[PDB]
Design a protein around this nucleic acid. Sequence first.
RNA 1: UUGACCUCGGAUCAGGUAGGAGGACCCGCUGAACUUAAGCAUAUCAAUAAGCGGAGGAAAAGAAACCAACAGGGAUUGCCCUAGUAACGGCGAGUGAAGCGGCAACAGCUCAAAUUUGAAAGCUGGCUUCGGCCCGCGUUGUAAUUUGGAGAGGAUGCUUUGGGCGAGGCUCCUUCUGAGUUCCCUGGAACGGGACGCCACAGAGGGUGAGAGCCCCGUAUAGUUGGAAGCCAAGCCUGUGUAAAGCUCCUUCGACGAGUCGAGUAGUUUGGGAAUGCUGCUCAAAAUGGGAGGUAAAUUUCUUCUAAAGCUAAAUACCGGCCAGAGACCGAUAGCGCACAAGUAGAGUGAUCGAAAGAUGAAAAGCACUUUGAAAAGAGGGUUAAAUAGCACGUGAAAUUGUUGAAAGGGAAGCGCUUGUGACCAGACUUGCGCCCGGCGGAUCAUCCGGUGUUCUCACCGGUGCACUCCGCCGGGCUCAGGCCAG
RNA 2: GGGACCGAGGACCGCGCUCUGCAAGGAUGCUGGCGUAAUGGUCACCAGCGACCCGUCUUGAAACACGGACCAAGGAGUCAAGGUUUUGCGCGAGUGUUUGGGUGUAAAACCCGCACGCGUAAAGGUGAGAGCUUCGGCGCAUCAUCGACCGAUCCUGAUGUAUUCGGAUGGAUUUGAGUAGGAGCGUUAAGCCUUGGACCCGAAAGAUGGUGAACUAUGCUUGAGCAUGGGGGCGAAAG
RNA 3: CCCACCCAUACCCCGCCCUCAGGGUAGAAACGAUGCCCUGAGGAGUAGGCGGCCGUGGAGGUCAGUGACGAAGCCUAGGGCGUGAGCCCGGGUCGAACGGCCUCUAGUGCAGAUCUUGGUGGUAGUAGCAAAUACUUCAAUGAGAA
RNA 4: AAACUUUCAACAACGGAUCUCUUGGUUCUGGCAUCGAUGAAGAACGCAGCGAAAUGCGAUAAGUAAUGUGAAUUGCAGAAUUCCGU
Lengths: 260, 117, 167, 134
Amino acid sequence: SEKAGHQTSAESWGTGRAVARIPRVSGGGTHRAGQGAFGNMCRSGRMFAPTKIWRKWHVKINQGQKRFATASALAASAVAPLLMARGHQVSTVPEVPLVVDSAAVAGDAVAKTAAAYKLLKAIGAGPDVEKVKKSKKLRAGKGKMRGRRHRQRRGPLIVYSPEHDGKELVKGFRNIPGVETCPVDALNLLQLAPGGHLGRFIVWTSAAIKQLDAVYESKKGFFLPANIVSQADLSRLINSTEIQSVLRAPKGEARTKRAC
Amino acid sequence: HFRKHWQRRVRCHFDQPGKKVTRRLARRAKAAALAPRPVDKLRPIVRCPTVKYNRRTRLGRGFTLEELKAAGIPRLLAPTIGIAVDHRRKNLSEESLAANVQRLKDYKARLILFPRK
Amino acid sequence: RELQKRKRRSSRPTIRMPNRRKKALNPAGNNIIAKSWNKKETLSQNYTRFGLVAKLGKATGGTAPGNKALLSESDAVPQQQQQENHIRQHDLELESKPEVLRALEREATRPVEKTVRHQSEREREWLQRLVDKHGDDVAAMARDRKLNPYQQTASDIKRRLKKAGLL
Amino acid sequence: MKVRPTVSSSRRKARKAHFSAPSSVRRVIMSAPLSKELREKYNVRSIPIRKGDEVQIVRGAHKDKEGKVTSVYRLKYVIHVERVTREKATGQTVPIGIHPSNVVITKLHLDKDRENILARIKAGREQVAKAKGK
RNA sequence: UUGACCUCGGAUCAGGUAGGAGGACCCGCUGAACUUAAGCAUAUCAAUAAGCGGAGGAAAAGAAACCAACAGGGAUUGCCCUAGUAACGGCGAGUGAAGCGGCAACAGCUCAAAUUUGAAAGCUGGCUUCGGCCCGCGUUGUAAUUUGGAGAGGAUGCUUUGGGCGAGGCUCCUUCUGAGUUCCCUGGAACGGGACGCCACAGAGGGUGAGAGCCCCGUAUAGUUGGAAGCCAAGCCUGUGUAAAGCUCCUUCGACGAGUCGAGUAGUUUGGGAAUGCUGCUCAAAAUGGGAGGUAAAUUUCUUCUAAAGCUAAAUACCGGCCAGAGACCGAUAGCGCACAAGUAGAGUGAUCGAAAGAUGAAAAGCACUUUGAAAAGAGGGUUAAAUAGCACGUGAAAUUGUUGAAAGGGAAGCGCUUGUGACCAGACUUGCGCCCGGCGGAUCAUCCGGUGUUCUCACCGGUGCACUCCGCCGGGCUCAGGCCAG
RNA sequence: GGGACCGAGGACCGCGCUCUGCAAGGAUGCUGGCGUAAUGGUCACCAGCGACCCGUCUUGAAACACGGACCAAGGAGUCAAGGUUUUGCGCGAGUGUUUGGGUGUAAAACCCGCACGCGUAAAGGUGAGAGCUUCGGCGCAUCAUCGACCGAUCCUGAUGUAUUCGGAUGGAUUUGAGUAGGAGCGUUAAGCCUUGGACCCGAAAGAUGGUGAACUAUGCUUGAGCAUGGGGGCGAAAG
RNA sequence: CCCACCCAUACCCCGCCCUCAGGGUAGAAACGAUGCCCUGAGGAGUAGGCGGCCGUGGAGGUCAGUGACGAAGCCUAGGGCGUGAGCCCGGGUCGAACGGCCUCUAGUGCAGAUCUUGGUGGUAGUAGCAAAUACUUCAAUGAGAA
RNA sequence: AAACUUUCAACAACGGAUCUCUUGGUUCUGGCAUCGAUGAAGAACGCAGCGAAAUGCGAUAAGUAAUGUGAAUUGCAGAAUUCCGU
């Protein structure tokens, strides 16, 4: 409140008495009377630099940098080490992009939540939906009193095509803990890289993989960025026949014997 | 430029997502009342005044009386079929006239009218 | 503020205002639009299904893919090419598709009721008295004063005679 | 999760409403499950308790103790059961509070309004099962 | 003498209305200082605060005496940009627009100026059998017609109607709608752990004796029972009077707001000496008129609007009213002054000033009874999982204090380095591997059989056996390696 | 010959020598002791030596002045707008989606129609010079030196001229934030500056609107007001 | 004038810490190339400038993290780690939630301000019985009954 | 030798920090528009067996009528008042 600590009539006692020159409230019949006021040092006073509505809460990020970051999160989701570095129990699925047939998800086939559970267990997402269930834990701190009472892990993100699969699949996966649903036209970085850590487990559908070329072509003002490195395997760059043929003889070993 | 009390007269816009929902609901509320009709009335094609924007062209306020009579739309019927009418504007050239009686003729081709009772 | 603290301590119940709106959001009735309007699709999405135009102005933003709702001269005459001083004043003489649009076209082209106005009983007596004196001479009927008190031209009397079947 | 805007996920508003509730809506809160025999006959799961209901305690230190309701104390969210009592210092026996969620109703106290309650739950449970089945 | 008309009064005559509150946001009036300019007066502060008047759910504004100089725009309002530009400036401090452009929202009208004059056609009241009768207002003007990008009146010919019911539908309240209290352990109490299930368009939230989707309320979804008031409306009854309405054409007409513009002057105000606007004073207009612009272009050539009467939704504001949902907020010296008796207790003549103060336990089971004795107190004894949780009550820090034990001391001692003595506490490498002989048992041994899964050559079971091989176990024998400190 | 202190490193590699191995690029061998205690810690006390007020703020000096009874909790360079420098990042002569529209699992995310802000636009020689090289030579960036072109004013004064107008050609010992083959836009982080309460606390004043203004007698004016500011009272200060 | 001896944070040799510098390290290393190895030199410090690291409230991800068979807090003449701010464990108490790591965020770290609020001391059972109020008791004023 | 003072430890006090909790605050967003001469806002006086530094109500006074629900109220007294029922 802008009036916090200002609802008092306090005047300083000046240089006369042997007290610290802090404003003290008037009156003479109450415990409040004579106490210091109007200061950050004072009990029931005003805090230093009071918090204001016009703090900068929202951050502007360029659309090119948002689409670069989404392109990197999608690419990291196709890498199997980065899935398990992100905490996903991914040791049972038989292909790390994990494209499921759209005919098994389209329409009312997954609209029941029991049928959505059965599909995830068949394709190998079973340990991941059980990881989040077993990780239900009360929150450490005062966020419990503010509406944030439990913390669980994240499960697989199902990416679908609203044009060819419909929205009935969203309702079947909505109650299963951890698992999240996202259309292929509206991919979200907060869901692709939760916590800023890359490598989300994604359960694609066959209609979404067809659309993935199209949705990234239709983005105006953006193209798929060119890497500054063509071959990112550095061991191939250094331990190649072309590089190693031209090098000087090694001037020493990894460990140098002490001379004196 | 903070010589006066800018603290007491600062306005934030945290209702920006909330006002957009209301504005889109007002357009949906309007289209519930005018269910087969379009939400907005037809407007004419006019040239921007100054020398800076002479080459550009925008939507005006309403159709001139000469534009309506040339198209074949009576004046007293046009507000009741979705055509905005401006009595202040004049034509002043045949290029402004011919562009708008083509627009009204194109409106009539795409218009379907239902009888009164 | 000091009012709100009184209600927190009082035993009187809080009066919960129901979520009411001045304007309804969704069309209702037995007509074509109300029986095919989906509650969960937008205005643009619904009019796309109908085949109708929602906004007649120019685009204020990028639209979703698939949306169709938000769209010899001797005298040098710039209007001769766009041709096809009195006009009809009340109607307009006009000239694979969606089912709602085809249904609305059957409503537009549906044949209507004529609802022919009739002459009043005293008006027929006034006109029949004029035939019974002058026959078919419209000039003398207009020029007559006793049987034509409100002096009307022969052109007006002839139209009223042709409506009443008395030639 | 919650969908409707009138629903609130506030712990503060929920705890205020529970502990400042009128006795009319305290009655619905003060409700108990029916037995296996009563579930398979009335097709009803849970009704509020009244005074005449023979009941069985299935949670707490007084487990597997059966009796009739003696009092429905709505102010402290307590039912009292016959012969479920403790002695004070003076020796006077006082009723022990069991919450209605810790008991299972064995025999109902049936009057005309109670059969109407039991019919309305059975009508809704039959309707949705038919709607889900066909 | 009587009766009007006008004007001014009376009435405890009949019917109405205003005051006050609230005032976050809105419309007017009035109006200040400090400060800055490192002094200070113009200026700034600030057309702000305080004071006064008046409204609403919005208000205000509003359908050009406008913007423009264009190939033109076209009521009002708000956002972005114009733009810290133009402009004005003790040219210091600084102050500071607007047009264009992209948007949001869009809606247009009512009078006065006329002769209904072949018919005051209009309206308030009263009495009313509710059907239609009287009084009065009013010609110093109440209806209809018209409102200047118009219109009137004729003529001509096409095109348009008006009332009353009204099934049903939308909004909002309500009724009902999934699944474990299955077995074991800890526990005072499972809501914890382990095993086996079930529901999920419902794993939001809360309660329940400890972390509960399936114990309870709710929550999701479509339905479903009853009801309220607005609005729409399929259809169905009637309509009517030579009634109203739109356009066309023209040897006929076409009225447009005055102590108001404007001129001088004073105050105020603005970026704005065509005063930017307003107000006061003195004088005081026009009709091929008036206003504001444009232009050196050769004379005020041209351009664009019509002032002094009025109404009107939307887009905009909102520290207040009726509610509702939220949060990377605070967590009882915090967060509103007030989580609780809080504008309370208390102080002041008064205007006003204005605190402190949350937590037993799952449940009061809130200590029966005996015995001290004068008490907000003990000793027994009891409740409870616990009373070193006993309405001084969760945890219970430090300052400070008492009792018990050890040691020291006499204006000492305290801190740094280094031993010594006493007291208490701790307890060093966790202490092993390898060979040989005999017996027993399993195998990854057997070119043994059968089966399963697989990455398709690798794994795992089931049954056979001990010729070979390899592991274990038991009973003997032997050797080696071991942490630290000394000499 | 006697004594003290020390033993760093951890397969071999080297220099060497008195060469079957050595004292040569850093300590091994042998013997003993160690669990009712090897070896440490804490407190108390004795002992030898040393020192014996902290923060601020001055001084040649703190031996000045200010603050300090103790303990708990609270407590002071923050946030906006705008400049500027540097780092990271995207795009690049362009850049910026987020006023707004569309959409959505709904204050999120995703998409963009016209504008708009800022910016860009409206090739020379020689010599050094990083790097390359067919070892002959090419030569980045940048610097220096002479040139080239644009504008300006001066004089020189062409075809021409409307007959009183012109600037062509030639040069300047002149100029510019001149051109000479773009480098910017957006964003994140840090530092500094301006303005706001502006790191926290601390004047005397000035203004606006209100509350109170006790008693006594006399005179004057229109019940009230004015005055004797009288007579009393409150406070001030002199150890 | 001569001889021998005593000790500084000075000089010489050795060990260890850190900084700076030079060198080595890929058909990869017997250790996160932001790693590892070899060598040399140097170390005071106010205003000031720069780097790393420790700790607190809250937010996202994660540890299939800890927990009524006892979380957090607190006490502690005990065992450790770090140069240090700090971190870990044991013993007791206690009864419901909490922590490590990578990022994000801030109302984030106290000995002072004649600081604020609270609690408690010495002075001191002293000066004192003045104001102030606490309890007991006693008078009066006005009513009664025995 | 007592006492007195100091330090440390155990136990016992004082005090209410720390941890945990939260029917409170703060901030944002959304739907809607409703005081008064038909006497408002505010100020008193009263109404319950024991009651306020509460709340409700107005001589019909912790309330009456009407509708819905369907078996209580509760700190103790106390109600032949109500349970297939206006």
